[PDB]
Amino acid sequence: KVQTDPPSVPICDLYPNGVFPKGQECEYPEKKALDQASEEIWNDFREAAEAHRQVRKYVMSWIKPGMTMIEICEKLEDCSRKLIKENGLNAGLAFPTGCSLNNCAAHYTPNAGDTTVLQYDDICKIDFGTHISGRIIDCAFTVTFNPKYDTLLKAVKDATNTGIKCAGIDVRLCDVGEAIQEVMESYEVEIDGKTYQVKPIRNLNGHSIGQYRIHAGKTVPIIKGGEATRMEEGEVYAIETFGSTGKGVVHDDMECSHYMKNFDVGHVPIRLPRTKHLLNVINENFGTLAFCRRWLDRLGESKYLMALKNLCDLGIVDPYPPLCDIKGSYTAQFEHTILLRPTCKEVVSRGDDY
Numbered sequence: 265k266v267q268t269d270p271p272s273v274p275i276c277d278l279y280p281n282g283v284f285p286k287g288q289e290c291e292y293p294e295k296k297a298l299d300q301a302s303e304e305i306w307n308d309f310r311e312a313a314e315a316h317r318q319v320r321k322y323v324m325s326w327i328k329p330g331m332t333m334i335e336i337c338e339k340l341e342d343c344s345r346k347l348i349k350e351n352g353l354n355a356g357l358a359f360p361t362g363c364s365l366n367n368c369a370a371h372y373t374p375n376a377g378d379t380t381v382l383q384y385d386d387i388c389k390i391d392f393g394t395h396i397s398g399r400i401i402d403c404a405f406t407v408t409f410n411p412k413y414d415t416l417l418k419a420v421k422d423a424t425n426t427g428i429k430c431a432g433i434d435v436r437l438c439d440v441g442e443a444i445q446e447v448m449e450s451y452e453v454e455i456d457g458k459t460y461q462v463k464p465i466r467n468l469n470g471h472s473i474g475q476y477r478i479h480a481g482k483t484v485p486i487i488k489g490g491e492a493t494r495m496e497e498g499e500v501y502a503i504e505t506f507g508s509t510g511k512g513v514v515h516d517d518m519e520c521s522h523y524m525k526n527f528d529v530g531h532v533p534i535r536l537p538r539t540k541h542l543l544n545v546i547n548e549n550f551g552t553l554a555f556c557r558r559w560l561d562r563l564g565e566s567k568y569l570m571a572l573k574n575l576c577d578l579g580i581v582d583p584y585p586p587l588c589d590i591k592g593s594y595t596a597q598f599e600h601t602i603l604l605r606p607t608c609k610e611v612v613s614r615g616d617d618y
């Protein structure tokens with residue numbers, strides 16, 4: 265019908281003819297046959313993007329200090345499952361809800377028992393994904409409550425918009441990175457009496473996206489010096505930028521919560537019973553999409569952590585631990601998914617919020 269208060273109507277019931285809203289369409293830096301031939305694919309990305317837009321609006325209305333990180337992720341994911349109309353691997357969540365705090369830039373979500381509470385001075389990166397038929401939206405924004413971080417957030421938002429504007433068919437990936445760094449490094453911020461020039465986090469990257477494949481193998485650098493590989497017609501990219509007051513480099517840190525089957529590993533016969541059962545659970549529920557330990561718990565799984573280690577040591581699954589700059593530093597992120605269509609560039613996850 266029309267969407268409800270706390271949103272509860274699936275996006276497919278809001279648009280009954282199966283035609284979903286376009287995102288921001290941009291001339292490259294006009295009605296092809298080739299573009300129209302892939303219309304069912306662009307449409308699937310747009311259904312996933314509208315879910316993402318409606319979920320994040322809802323999240324911005326209630327996220328507050330005092331909530332636990334588990335409470336925040338569970339409330340967000342509940343809404344996302346409802347609006348995407350979760351249906352096995354045909355529609356659902358593409359990857360776990362990131363809510364990385366402070367010096368941590370990516371790949372933290374709480375595991376069971378985590379008592380972390382969101383604080384007034386925290387800078388929290390909300391990064392979550394939706395998909396229809398494997399067509400994935402990766403889009404992320406930063407949440408703050410103290411106005412002291414406003415210029416750091418504006419620097420990163422401007423750098424992400426700069427990378428989105430530079431992107432195009434036949435554009436060299438190294439040129440997008442050099443562009444993003446020049447804008448991000450034009451910002452200086454002052455936080456609690458200390459001044460900083462904002463630094464891109466040089467070992468974090470954007471990435472191409474493939475069907476059921478969050479990282480399809482091409483990386484989008486956010487500093488100069490990368491590869492001159494060109495972007496191609498038909499590719500889809502997550503253009504993401506990260507900025508920091510610290511060293512501008514991340515390392516692995518904290519407990520791991522995010523995992524994903526290696527895309528190129530084939531069928532592996534396993535006899536160990538608990539390891540075989542967990543691999544079957546992952547193949548049925550996630551396939552090649554990323555998952556977290558809270559999502560195994562929700563399925564009624566327990567006593568799985570050694571079976572999960574076994575699958576990692578066999579190379580069937582890869583762990584993706586949180587990625588953090590040095591203690592005391594502040595990091596921020598903004599990201600959109602773009603489609604490199606034959607007739608135009610589409611920023612499919614653009615909203616009136618960012």
Ligand SMILES: *C[C@@]1(O)CC[C@@H](OC(=O)/C=C/C=C/C=C/C=C/C(=O)O)[C@@H](OC)[C@@H]1[C@@]1(C)O[C@@H]1CC=C(C)C
Pocket residue numbers: 359360370371467468469470471478479483514515516522523524554584587
């Ligand atoms: C999750 C994510 O999208 C985050 C941003 C991208 O990550 C990276 O660029 C990874 C760099 C890691 C560097 C580690 C250095 C360690 C040094 C040390 O410990 O000494 C992005 O990848 C381009 C990444 C992702 C897409 O690849 C992940 C798959 C997605 C999941 C798990 C949700």
Ligand SMILES: [Co+2]
Pocket residue numbers: 391392402403404502504599
């Ligand atoms: Co992301």
Ligand SMILES: [Co+2]
Pocket residue numbers: 402470471502504599
């Ligand atoms: Co991403």
